[PDB]
Write a protein that binds this ligand. Sequence first.
Ligand code: SFG
Length: 184
Amino acid sequence: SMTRIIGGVAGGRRIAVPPTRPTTDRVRESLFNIVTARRDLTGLAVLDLYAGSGALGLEALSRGAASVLFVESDQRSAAVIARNIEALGLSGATLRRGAVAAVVAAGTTSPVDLVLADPPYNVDSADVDAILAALGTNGWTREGTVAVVERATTCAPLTWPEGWRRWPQRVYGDTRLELAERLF
Ligand SMILES: Nc1ncnc2c1ncn2[C@@H]1O[C@H](C[C@@H](N)CC[C@H](N)C(=O)O)[C@@H](O)[C@H]1O
């Protein structure tokens, strides 16, 4: 089931996927429909957590985001992300191989505008709760920053920390999508 970029300059162009448990195309089409309805991506900086194939970040990249930081701990997955960045031939992509919770913990001096996260099933939801909290204090978020998390309906829902305003939860087949934005 080889996936392809949905919208943007790279619309239609194919990207590769590792082995894994990746996002369905309707989930990706819908997430960007939701996000792009309420923000324009052009000039926006993006953080893609547990990037896997990079499909989500390559999508935002295609639709005009300025930069995407892909964070992914598996080396074969990081290689797949790099191949895909090359095949699409778009600028602004940076790749950071490492443990997502370690990277988020280490902080940053420049906030992003959209955080994309697809945590694998070995990650517990309460630990994802901790990453969302860290996004707020460790410099990753600014006022208006959107966060989106994809999980299996099997998984326990997220508990968002103060300072975030939840958007309406969505479900697609057996996948839950949670969205919020920073208030600051
Ligand atoms: N601490 C971790 N940090 C970064 N990546 C991880 C970590 N734990 C597991 N992963 C990887 O995160 C990815 C989770 C995937 N479901 C993401 C899929 C991706 N969004 C896609 O549809 O292509 C897998 O590639 C894991 O190897």
